[PDB]
Amino acid sequence: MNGTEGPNFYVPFSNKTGVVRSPFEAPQYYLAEPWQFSMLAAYMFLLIMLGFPINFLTLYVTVQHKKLRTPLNYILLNLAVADLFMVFGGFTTTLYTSLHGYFVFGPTGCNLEGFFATLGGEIALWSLVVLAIERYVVVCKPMSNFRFGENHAIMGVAFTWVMALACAAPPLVGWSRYIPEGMQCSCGIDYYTPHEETNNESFVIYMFVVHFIIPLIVIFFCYGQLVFTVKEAAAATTQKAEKEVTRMVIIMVIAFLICWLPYAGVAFYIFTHQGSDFGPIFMTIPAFFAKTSAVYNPVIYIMMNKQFRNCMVTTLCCGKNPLGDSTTVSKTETSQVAPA
Ligand SMILES: *[C@@H]1O[C@H](CO)[C@@H](O[C@]2(O)O[C@H](CO)[C@@H](O[C@@]3(O)O[C@H](CO)[C@@H](O)[C@H](O)[C@@H]3O)[C@H](O)[C@H]2NC(C)=O)[C@H](O)[C@H]1NC(C)=O
Ligand SMILES: *[C@@H]1O[C@H](CO)[C@@H](O[C@]2(O)O[C@H](CO)[C@@H](O)[C@H](O)[C@H]2NC(C)=O)[C@H](O)[C@H]1NC(C)=O
Ligand SMILES: CCCCCCCCCO[C@@H]1O[C@H](CO)[C@@H](O)[C@H](O)[C@H]1O
Ligand SMILES: CCCCCCCCCO[C@@H]1O[C@H](CO)[C@@H](O)[C@H](O)[C@H]1O
Ligand SMILES: CCCCCCCCCO[C@@H]1O[C@H](CO)[C@@H](O)[C@H](O)[C@H]1O
Ligand SMILES: CCCCCCCCCO[C@@H]1O[C@H](CO)[C@@H](O)[C@H](O)[C@H]1O
Ligand SMILES: CCCCCCCCCO[C@@H]1O[C@H](CO)[C@@H](O)[C@H](O)[C@H]1O
Ligand SMILES: *C/C=C(C)/C=C\C=C(C)\C=C\C1=C(C)CCCC1(C)C
Ligand SMILES: *C(=O)CCCCCCCCCCCCCCC
Ligand SMILES: *C(=O)CCCCCCCCCCCCCCC
Ligand SMILES: [Hg+2]
Ligand SMILES: [Hg+2]
Ligand SMILES: [Hg+2]
Ligand SMILES: [Zn+2]
Ligand SMILES: [Zn+2]
Ligand SMILES: [Zn+2]
Ligand SMILES: [Zn+2]
Numbered sequence: 001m002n003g004t005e006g007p008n009f010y011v012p013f014s015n016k017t018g019v020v021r022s023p024f025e026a027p028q029y030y031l032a033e034p035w036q037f038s039m040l041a042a043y044m045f046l047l048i049m050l051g052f053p054i055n056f057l058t059l060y061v062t063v064q065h066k067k068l069r070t071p072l073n074y075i076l077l078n079l080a081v082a083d084l085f086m087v088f089g090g091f092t093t094t095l096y097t098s099l100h101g102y103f104v105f106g107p108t109g110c111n112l113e114g115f116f117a118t119l120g121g122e123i124a125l126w127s128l129v130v131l132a133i134e135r136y137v138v139v140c141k142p143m144s145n146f147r148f149g150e151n152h153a154i155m156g157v158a159f160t161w162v163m164a165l166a167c168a169a170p171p172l173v174g175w176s177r178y179i180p181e182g183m184q185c186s187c188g189i190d191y192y193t194p195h196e197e198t199n200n201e202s203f204v205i206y207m208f209v210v211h212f213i214i215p216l217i218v219i220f221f222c223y224g225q226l227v228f229t230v231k232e233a234a235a236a237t238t239q240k241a242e243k244e245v246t247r248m249v250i251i252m253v254i255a256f257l258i259c260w261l262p263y264a265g266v267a268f269y270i271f272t273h274q275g276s277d278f279g280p281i282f283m284t285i286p287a288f289f290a291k292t293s294a295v296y297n298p299v300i301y302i303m304m305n306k307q308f309r310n311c312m313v314t315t316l317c318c319g320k321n322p323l324g325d326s327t328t329v330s331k332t333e334t335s336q337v338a339p340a
Helices: 034-064 071-100 106-134 150-168 200-225 239-272 280-294 296-304 306-316
Strands: 178-181 186-189
Touching: 034 071, 034 280, 034 296, 034 306, 071 106, 071 150, 071 239, 071 280, 071 296, 106 150, 106 178, 106 186, 106 200, 106 239, 106 280, 150 200, 178 280, 186 200, 186 280, 200 239, 239 280, 239 296, 280 296, 296 306
Parallel strands: none
Antiparallel strands: 178 186
16 A cells, blocks of 8 residues: 555555554654754744734724725635634644644644634635625626625625535534645645545535535636626726726635645545555645635735725824825724715
8 A cells, every 4th residue: 555544544655664653643754854844834834923914914904994894895804814713723733733743633633724724715715706796796787776785795704604614614523524634734634535434535526516616617607707897907987996806806816726726636636546656745735835825815905905005004004194106994084984
């Protein structure tokens, strides 16, 4: 056999040398060198040191500036939060693991690690479907009359949390499960073994279809309609606003892919070629690289949303003077409404 199946794991290392051992009981240093682990540990340490402030600041600024209530500002508050969950929920355990060499906290540390990453990535995917719509109703405007009040914005955010849970919560209760991957420092869904005892085979399709293919077809086709109205470049007059938020909601989709396609791809490969011959390094790269999903969203936001960027500077400068190159929002300053 080219892997070592366990009742809890599956190390992608042969054990015709009795060197293999439970990623929940001893260092996996025979899978690679002790420094590559120190790399993962340094790398995660930086991810935590970065995703934390970026996401926390984002959260903070959104709430402090009382006029940042568009559905988009809503969605990003959501991501900023989900992201903070990953940071503490999972990255905490994935850092301690990479350090001490194995899932020293057993399956729990593994479900923390694995659960909070899925929760975080699916929330991002399902959020992208919300934006894919909120974006459809503003450009290819349907009803001769409509705009999303915070009313409907709190709807789509509550939604991404149901869908995300529908996908990440099951493995914690008996449908599929979180098992360590790569150098065994991160935990993912079970693609490795059939384990009829929990039905991993069923879930993995449930997930690849209900939580990957479909949201992707939705998000892709919806875009095919928004291929005339708001063309694709960038640089009333209130049209260059929604014509710009859109170019953002689109760079968010490129990024999601860049992040999960390589993982999802390797994950689907495994499922299809279970028990074949792959190494620990195989999935360690797309798995760990995807952990940057806990921080790129706010970066895109702060760079593609002139409005938020200044609101961020405004909070950071306590007062103002945001060296810009259009409307507003804040607190005791000009957070006054200007509707109709
Ligand atoms: C690869 O093959 C190895 C041997 O061929 C397996 O190693 C062991 O089976 O590991 C167990 C640990 O569970 C050892 O038995 C001990 O440790 O069991 C209890 C732990 O619950 C201890 O308290 C006792 O002291 C036992 O020694 C075995 O000694 C050891 N086998 C050997 C080297 O003879 C190894 O698990 C296997 N890899 C896999 C499939 O994970
Ligand atoms: C062990 O791993 C090897 C490497 O994949 C498996 O060999 C291989 O996959 O076998 C399939 C059919 O069984 C061939 O079509 C293919 O050519 C092989 N891959 C190569 C290029 O070596 C082998 O099947 C695995 N054994 C198991 C299931 O434990
Ligand atoms: C997408 C760029 C175009 C901006 C319009 C979309 C978001 C609408 C924000 O509306 C404002 O929300 C405030 C509460 O947050 C209300 O107090 C205020 O009366 C209302 O007018
Ligand atoms: C982190 C996410 C990475 C996404 C990077 C996306 C940047 C690619 C932008 O494309 C370019 O936009 C110009 C303006 O419209 C076009 O004139 C040009 O032909 C097109 O190639
Ligand atoms: C990590 C994600 C950040 C990468 C940014 C993705 C490339 C999109 C570039 O588009 C341009 O950005 C300018 C901001 O200076 C806008 O003023 C301009 O109208 C817009 O067309
Ligand atoms: C869009 C990015 C998605 C990435 C998906 C990558 C999955 C392809 C894996 O290929 C296989 O890897 C094995 C060991 O690594 C080789 O032994 C085998 O010959 C090779 O065919
Ligand atoms: C994205 C790259 C795809 C490659 C997938 C297989 C990589 C497996 C690497 O294995 C490791 O190589 C070290 C140096 O040879 C050995 O010391 C160690 O024991 C072995 O476990
Ligand atoms: C380091 C830990 C990781 C990456 C753990 C778990 C991730 C998943 C189970 C991923 C789910 C997927 C996402 C977020 C995006 C589309 C579908 C999917 C299965 C690839
Ligand atoms: C509200 O407006 C908050 C004030 C923001 C001021 C930020 C000052 C930055 C700190 C300067 C550090 C310079 C390097 C010092 C090295 C010893
Ligand atoms: C306004 O006074 C000029 C801006 C310079 C001060 C801003 C300091 C740099 C921002 C660093 C971000 C850290 C925020 C931490 C959030 C938890
Ligand atoms: Hg769209
Ligand atoms: Hg990314
Ligand atoms: Hg602002
Ligand atoms: Zn079992
Ligand atoms: Zn989901
Ligand atoms: Zn199978
Ligand atoms: Zn500016």
